[PDB]
């Protein structure tokens, strides 16, 4: 098990543009494209938003995909996004310290969070980050669950939290 396999499990793999729970158009292995209008929105705003997402994809891939890519392309974007998440951590003054204080398994859990909610979002878990740096695993676990993150994606959050708690890949084995 490793960060790529871990995120492949949590993000899945879809070769056609779809929208996630946060209402964002996405593709491949959790690659975010653009936000989507209201469910009522407007038949026009809809097509506009779809085209906006499609243009982002062509830009990312460098070709006219029409909203469809291949597995190789999905993995290409995935490699780029995993790298971007790590670099984001290293460049952030609040995240780097925590990341460096963690063992390799828990480092993957942090990358997972940043990959999903972005550098800025995770850097906001001030109290959780302090507990992790202090290696107060159980307290950090309880605190991490008190979040929109946990409430909106409980199954995934539980796997990530358990990883921070145990320092093992037990939550991802047998999946
Ligand atoms: Cl990109």
Swiss-Prot record:
Belongs to the glycosyl hydrolase 24 family. Changing residue 30 to A: Almost complete loss of enzymatic activity. This is Endolysin. Changing residue 128 to I: 500-fold decrease in enzymatic activity. The keyword Hydrolase applies. Its EC number is 3.2.1.17. Pfam families: Phage_lysozyme (PF00959). Substrate binds at residues 32, 115, 128, 143. Optimum pH is 7.3.
């Amino acid at each position: 098990m490793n960060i790529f396999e871990m995120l492949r499990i949590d993000e899945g793999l879809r070769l056609k543009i779809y929208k996630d729970t946060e209402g964002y158009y996405t593709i491949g292995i959790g690659h975010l494209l653009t936000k989507s209008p209201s469910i009522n929105a407007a038949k026009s705003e809809l097509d506009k938003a779809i085209n906006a997402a499609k243009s982002e994809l062509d830009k990312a891939i460098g070709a006219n995909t029409n909203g469809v890519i291949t597995k190789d392309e999905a993995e290409k974007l995935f490699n780029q996004d995993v790298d971007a998440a790590v670099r984001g951590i290293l460049r952030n003054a609040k995240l780097k310290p925590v990341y460096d204080s963690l063992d390799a398994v828990r480092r993957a859990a942090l990358i997972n969070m940043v990959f999903q909610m972005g550098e800025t979002g995770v850097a906001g878990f001030t109290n959780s980050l302090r507990m992790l740096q202090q290696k107060r695993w159980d307290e950090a676990a309880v605190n991490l669950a008190k979040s929109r993150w946990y409430n909106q994606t409980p199954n995934r959050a539980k796997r990530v939290i358990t990883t921070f708690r145990t320092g093992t890949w037990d939550a991802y084995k047998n999946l």
